[PDB]
Structures are given as structure tokens and as C-alpha cells.
Amino acid sequence: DVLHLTQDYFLPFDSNLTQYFSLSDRYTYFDNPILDFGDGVYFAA
């Protein structure tokens, strides 16, 4: 029950995420490249 604010690595609000397609159920060249970890990654599938 507090209102805490902090400085840390976060995903910025309303940011643009790259869309990758995956689905031998592989019709339109569904694959995955090597991405960049950076200092933190948000993965939504």
C-alpha cells in the first residue's frame, strides 16, 4: 500500500515491437533469426 517510484530497466510505454511469424506446419517461411538481448528483453508470444 505504497506509491513507490524507482529507476530501472523497463519496457517503455506505447513502444513499437517487431512482429515475427511462426506457424511440418510451416506455410509462409516461418522461422526465427538471432535477436539482440541488450540489457533486458520482453518476450510476448
Place this chain on the structure above:
Amino acid sequence: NNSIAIPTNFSISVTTEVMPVSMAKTSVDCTMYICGDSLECSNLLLQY
């Protein structure tokens, strides 16, 4: 005990009086005064 002083003539005088009313309004930011553009100082300042 039996003498009085009554004036026979007069004058109109204009006098000036100066009075302060308001002063300058000042706004102070804790950031870019205490720490400046320094994220290391800004991280420690979040507790204040």
C-alpha cells in the same frame, strides 16, 4: 485661561506615500540544482 488661537487662513497640501504590494514569485527545481544532469546523483535523490 482666557486666550485662544483661531487661524485666519489655510492651505491645501499633497503628500506622497509609497507602499509595497507584491514581490517576485520564484520556482525552484530540486533536480538540475542539487544533482544537475547526473543520473548517479538522481538515483540517490529518490529517497528525498
